[PDB]
Amino acid sequence: MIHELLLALSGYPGSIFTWNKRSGLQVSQDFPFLHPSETSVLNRLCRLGTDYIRFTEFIEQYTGGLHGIYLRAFCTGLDSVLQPYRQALLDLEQEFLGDPHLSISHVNYFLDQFQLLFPSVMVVVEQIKSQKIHGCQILETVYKHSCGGLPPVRSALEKILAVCHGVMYKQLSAWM
Amino acid sequence: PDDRSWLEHHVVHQYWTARPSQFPHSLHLHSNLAAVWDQHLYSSDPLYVPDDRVLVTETQVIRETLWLLSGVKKLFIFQLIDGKVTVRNNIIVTHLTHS
Amino acid sequence: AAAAAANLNAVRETMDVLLEISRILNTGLDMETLSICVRLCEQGINPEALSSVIKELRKATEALK
C-alpha cells in the first residue's frame, strides 16, 4: 500500500491506480479496509503522479518534425528538475521504515511545492507539442515563463535554460 | 532432520522447492496488501476458484533480477520461452498483489 | 530471549527520543545524567523538588571553577 503507492507515484501503475491515457491513475474500487472519504484525498494526489508519468514519455521519444539537439537539451534539464522528486520518493520509504502510524496527509503535506512546479511546465510541454517549434525558438517560450510568478517554477526553468545556452556555446565556438 | 532444518533455515529452498511457507510480519495493511485485496475479492464473490501461487519473499526477487543483470542464462523466474525473457506469472508476495 | 531483547531495543528507541526532546529545548543535562533522572521519575516523587535539587547542585559545581 505504501509500496504500491510509491510505485504508482513512480512509473508502474498496478491493480489499484490503473493507467489510461484518456484518464490517468483511476480509482473506482471501493475500499472497506480504508475510510470512505479517503478516496477524495487520493484523487487530489493522483494529479501529482500523472504529470510525472507524463513527463517521462516526452523524454523518451525526443532522445521532419520535433527533433534536434535543442530537443536533447530541454529533456536533459527536465531530468534535473525532477531529481528532487525522485529523492523525495526514497525519503517516504525511509520514513515508513520506522513508523506504522503514518498517513496520507503527511505525503500530501511533504510534496506541496510540486503542485505548482509541475502544472506550469505541463503547459510548456503541451505548447512545444502543439506548435511545431523545434529550432532556437524553443528557448523563447521558456524565457517568457522563466520570469515566473511562483517560486518553484522560477528556479527549475532556470536550470533547464542554462543547459540550452551551454549547448549554444558549442555552435558559437565552432563558428567564431 | 537437524541437517535439513539447518538447510531450510539458512538457505531458502522454499520457492524453487515445494513447501508452503509463511511469514507473519506483524500484518495489517501497510505490508499486508495482497492478502487484504484477496479477502476483499472473495467477499465480493469473484465467483471463486482462488489462485494458488508460490508466495516468494522480497529480497529473493531482488537477487534474481541482479543475477539476470549479470548475464546468467536460463533462470527459475524470467525463463525464455521464445528467445525473449518471459517473467513467471505464478508469483505472489504479501504486498502489490503481483500486478 | 529474542523478543525480550526486542523490547529492550524498543525502549532504547524511546529513550533516544527522550534525548532528542532534551536537546531541542536546550538543557544542561546529558544522557548519563538523564539515565538517573528517568529512574527517579519512575519511582515517583514531586518533580519540582528534583528541579530544585538540580538547580542547587549545578550551583555547587561552579565552585570547582
Binding site: - | 505490508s31 504479501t94 | 531495543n9 539515565s35
Partner: peptide
C-alpha cells in the same frame, strides 16, 4: 543495573515486510 544496560547499541539493519519491531 537496568537503564545502564539499556544504553546498548542495537541493530541498524531493517526489514521492509516487518513493520512492528524489525530487529
Amino acid at each position: 543495573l537496568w537503564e545502564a544496560a539499556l544504553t546498548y547499541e542495537a541493530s541498524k539493519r531493517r526489514c521492509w515486510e516487518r513493520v512492528g519491531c524489525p530487529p
